[PDB]
Amino acid sequence: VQLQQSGVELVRAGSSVKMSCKASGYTFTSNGINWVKQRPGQGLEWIGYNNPGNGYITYNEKFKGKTTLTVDKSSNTAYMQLRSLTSEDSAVYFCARSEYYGGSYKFDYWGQGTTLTVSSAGTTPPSVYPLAPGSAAQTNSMVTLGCLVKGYFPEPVTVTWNSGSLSSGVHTFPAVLQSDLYTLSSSVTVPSSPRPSETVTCNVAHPASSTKVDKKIVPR
Amino acid sequence: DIQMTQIPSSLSASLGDRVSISCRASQDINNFLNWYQQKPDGTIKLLIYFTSRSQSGVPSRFSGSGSGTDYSLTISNLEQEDIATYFCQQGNALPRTFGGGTKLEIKRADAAPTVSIFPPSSEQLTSGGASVVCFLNNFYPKDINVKWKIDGSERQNGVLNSWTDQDSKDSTYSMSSTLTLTKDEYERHNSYTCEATHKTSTSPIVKSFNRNECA
C-alpha cells in the first residue's frame, strides 16, 4: 500500500491550497483516509476523516470551517483544502489510512507528508561567504574552516566541500529562518597539513533558483 | 477531548538498555491505543495497535501494555535505528488525539565542545553587512549556553543559533551561533567574544578576536 502526497506548498497569507493524497496498492473505497497536521513544534493534530466508500466525513471542530475534505474515487485521490491561510498554518500535513481492528481503527499506512509554508518571501538565491580562521592562530593540529550561506528562499540548499571529496569533519547546520529568509552554515576541520597548501572550496547549490556558487577559503 | 500525556518528553538511554515509555489518557480508553514511530527524517509508521498488537514488519523488541488510562511502550534492547520520537494515539472517541511525543537520544560520556570563532568575510563587509560566526562542535550533553560580548557588553540582539541532530557515529551534538551587525556598528568595536557554558567545565570557554589584529 502507498499514499503519495503533494499539493501547493509555497503560499502567501490570505490564499488557499488544495493538497492531494493518492492511494495505491489496495481498493480505495475500502478504507477511510485521515489528515494530520504537525507544526515544527513537535506535536501531532488530527484534522478530520473521509471514507471514500460511504462518503462519510468528519472534522476536528478546530479545523471545521477552514478545512474541506473531498475525494475523487475515479483516480483514487483524497484532497484537503485549506483556506484563509495564515502563518500558523505553516506545517507538514500527512494523510494516513484507517484499518479496522476489532473495536477501533489503526492508522496503518502514512503518506510522506506535504510541507505547507506560508510566507511573503520570493525566490532568492543565497550569498555564500567563506569563513577563514581569524586573527591569531585559530586551532592546533586541526583547522576549522566554514561557509556562511545567507538569505535564500526557498529551502533547500545543498552544501558540499571539495565537490564532496571532503566528507569527514563536515557539519552542516539546519537552516534558520531569519527575516523570512533562510541562513545556514557549515564547517569543516582539516589537519593544518592541507589548507592553505591544499585548496578547500565550499560548493553550494540552490535548485529553486538554479544557482551554484564555489567559494575557496583563503587566508585572511 | 481525551487528553493524552507521555511521561518522559525526552529520554536518554545507552544502546542495549531496556526502554519504557508512558502514555496516560484523561479517561478510560478501553485499550484503543496505538503507537507511532517518527524517524528523524520525518516519516511515520505504526508500531503497535490495540494496546499490544504488533504491526506487521516491526522488530520484535517493541511490545506495549496497559489498561484504563495507563499504557507503556517498551523497547527490550535499544538499537541505534530506534532513535526517534514516539507517539501514542487514542482511538476511543472523537476527536482522535495524540500524546505530545517522546524523543530518544543515546547516552554517552560528556564531551567538551571544540569552539572556533570567525570574523566577517571581506566579501560580506563590501555589502555593508557583518556576521561573526562561532562553531561549538562535538559536545555532549546537548544543553549548552552561548553568550556574545562586544567590548565587554553582552549579545541578545541579532543572534541566530542552530543545532545539529545527535551524530549517528559519536553521539555528540554540534551548534552554530551567528551574530549579525551592520558594517558601521562592527567597525566601531574592537573585540568579539563567543562564550560557552557547558556541564564539562565550571568556567566558560571563551574564543575572541580583535578587529585590528591583522596577522
From Swiss-Prot, chain A:
GO CC term (a single one): immunoglobulin complex
Coiled-coil region list: none
Pfam families the record matches: V-set
SMART domains reported for this sequence: IG (SM00409), IGv (SM00406)
Gene3D superfamilies: Immunoglobulins
UniProt entry tagged with the keyword Zinc-finger: no
Keywords of the record: Adaptive immunity, Hybridoma, Immunity, Immunoglobulin
Example GO molecular function: antigen binding
Ig-like domain span: 1-111
Gene Ontology biological process terms, A to Z: immunoglobulin mediated immune response
S-S pairs: none
Note: From analysis of the sizes of several other differentiated genes that hybridize to this one, the authors conclude that all of these V regions have rearranged to the same J segment, JH2.
PANTHER family: IMMUNOGLOBULIN HEAVY CHAIN (PTHR23266)
Protein name per Swiss-Prot or TrEMBL: Ig heavy chain V region 36-65
